[PDB]
Amino acid sequence: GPHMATGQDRVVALVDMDCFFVQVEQRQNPHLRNKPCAVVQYKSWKGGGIIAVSYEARAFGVTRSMWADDAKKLCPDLLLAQVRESRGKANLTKYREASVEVMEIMSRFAVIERASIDEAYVDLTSAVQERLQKLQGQPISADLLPSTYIEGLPQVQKEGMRKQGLFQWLDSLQIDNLTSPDLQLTVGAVIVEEMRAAIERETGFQCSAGISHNKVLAKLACGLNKPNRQTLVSHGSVPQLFSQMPIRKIRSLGGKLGASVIEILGIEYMGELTQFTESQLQSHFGEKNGSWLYAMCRGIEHDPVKPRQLPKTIGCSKNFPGKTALATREQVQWWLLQLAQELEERLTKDRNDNDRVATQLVVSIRVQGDKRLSSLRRCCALTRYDAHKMSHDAFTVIKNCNTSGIQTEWSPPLTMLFLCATKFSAS
DNA sequence: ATGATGACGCT
DNA sequence: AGCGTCAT
Ligand SMILES: Nc1ccn([C@@H]2O[C@H](COP(=O)(O)OP(=O)(O)OP(=O)(O)O)[C@@H](O)[C@H]2O)c(=O)n1
Ligand SMILES: [Ca+2]
Numbered sequence: 001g002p003h004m005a006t007g008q009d010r011v012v013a014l015v016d017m018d019c020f021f022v023q024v025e026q027r028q029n030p031h032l033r034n035k036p037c038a039v040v041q042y043k044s045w046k047g048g049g050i051i052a053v054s055y056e057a058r059a060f061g062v063t064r065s066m067w068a069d070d071a072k073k074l075c076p077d078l079l080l081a082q083v084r085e086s087r088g089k090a091n092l093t094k095y096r097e098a099s100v101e102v103m104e105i106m107s108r109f110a111v112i113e114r115a116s117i118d119e120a121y122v123d124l125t126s127a128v129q130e131r132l133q134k135l136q137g138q139p140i141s142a143d144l145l146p147s148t149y150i151e152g153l154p155q156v157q158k159e160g161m162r163k164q165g166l167f168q169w170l171d172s173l174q175i176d177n178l179t180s181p182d183l184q185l186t187v188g189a190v191i192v193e194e195m196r197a198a199i200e201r202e203t204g205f206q207c208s209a210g211i212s213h214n215k216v217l218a219k220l221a222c223g224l225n226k227p228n229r230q231t232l233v234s235h236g237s238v239p240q241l242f243s244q245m246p247i248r249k250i251r252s253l254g255g256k257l258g259a260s261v262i263e264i265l266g267i268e269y270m271g272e273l274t275q276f277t278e279s280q281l282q283s284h285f286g287e288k289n290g291s292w293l294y295a296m297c298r299g300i301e302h303d304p305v306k307p308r309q310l311p312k313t314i315g316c317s318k319n320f321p322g323k324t325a326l327a328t329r330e331q332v333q334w335w336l337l338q339l340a341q342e343l344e345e346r347l348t349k350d351r352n353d354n355d356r357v358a359t360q361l362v363v364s365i366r367v368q369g370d371k372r373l374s375s376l377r378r379c380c381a382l383t384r385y386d387a388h389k390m391s392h393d394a395f396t397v398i399k400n401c402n403t404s405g406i407q408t409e410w411s412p413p414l415t416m417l418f419l420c421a422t423k424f425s426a427s
Numbered sequence: 428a429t430g431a432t433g434a435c436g437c438t
Numbered sequence: 439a440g441c442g443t444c445a446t
């Protein structure tokens with residue numbers, strides 16, 4: 001009892017932009033606002049591939065990875081915006097720059113960990129302590145939490161249900177105990193309301209957020225009420241929430257490990273994991289995974305919010321599917337040059353912006369027939385931000401993968417090329 | 428024939 | 439070093 005850690009030591013939020021690329025294109029082109037629309041890449045094959053879908057279009061069944069021609073069968077009025085194409089490949093600069101807008105606003109409030117182009121974790125523990133010292137111990141008005149859901153509460157319209165739950169939560173809150181984890185989460189949610197208001201005011205972009213005691217629960221919380229809402233998942237809410245929560249919904253369990261937990265243990269839901277000892281879970285899934293699962297199914301996780309806003313690698317890739325697979329030496333060399341030129345542009349901007357230089361170039365390829373992301377990776381020194389040198393060096397390190405006897409031909413044909421600059425040093 | 432990109436674990 | 443897993 002008195003010696004059992006409860007994983008209530010931190011306040012962590014996860015902020016996730018709603019249909020991010022669609023919002024970027026809707027900000028730029030007001031004719032797309034409040035419409036079923038989608039963002040596509042490429043255009044000639046089946047109208048292009050859908051990468052992002054507005055909530056109006058999702059109501060028709062339009063999803064990511066669908067071909068736009070097929071999405072138009074579900075939603076004939078679907079509007080489309082296309083990703084910029086430069087040197088024959090998709091160019092995502094517009095969305096990376098919009099991402100920086102949002103991340104810089106979030107960084108004013110707290111240390112953030114960039115998790116993807118449109119997600120960041122926030123460690124709010126210190127900011128909460130400060131706010132509890134200020135204006136205390138005054139009660140927290142529901143007006144400070146206008147878009148917050150309390151998971152598990154209450155207990156015929158959506159907003160009435162939201163407010164009934166918020167009222168039940170605020171009425172039970174012990175506002176005189178500055179160390180109450182539930183109070184700390186509530187103040188965390190107040191700050192996240194302020195952060196999300198600042199993002200929307202200064203960029204036009206809406207987002208969702210989760211607030212809890214660790215990254216996994218904050219990520220789970222964020223998805224419970226999308227879009228344009230935030231959700232607080234308390235430690236006390238975990239047993240009911242996990243009791244019907246498919247294992248695959250928890251971050252890192254969406255793949256082979258999660259499938260093996262289900263198959264080996266014969267369970268379906270996250271809460272069912274509590275019945276196993278730590279040693280049992282370590283025996284099936286390894287020491288690290290087993291300890292992690294034992295704590296996580298109790299709502300406890302210690303992965304820190306890392307202080308990192310910049311990517312550790314900068315990379316450029318293109319797939320060559322089907323009959324387009326690269327099959328001549330001139331083809332491989334020309335596309336390596338195209339990738340190297342885009343990479344040079346990104347690296348030179350990175351060096352000016354962030355005072356650092358990459359020192360290693362990783363070349364990844366996939367060969368036709370291979371189901372893996374990469375069939376082969378090789379690396380060489382990155383000593384100059386020069387596209388011709390980078391592309392020549394990349395060819396040098398993959399040259400002898402070519403099994404073809406004819407010198408102008410490449411066998412087996414290449415279905416992906418990927419150049420990645422890594423091992424940054426201060427500059 | 429989604430495709431573009433990124434973090435991190437294992438050996 | 440080079441491959442495997444999981445993710446947005
Ligand atoms: N299979 C995937 C999933 C996502 N992404 C990248 O991750 C971004 C954001 O992904 P996600 O948050 O899943 O989708 P949103 O469009 O933001 O929709 P939501 O409102 O559900 O968050 C996408 O724009 C895309 O750049 C991707 O490349 N490939
Ligand atoms: Ca998103």
Ligand SMILES: [Ca+2]
Pocket residue numbers: 016017116118119446
């Ligand atoms: Ca996301």
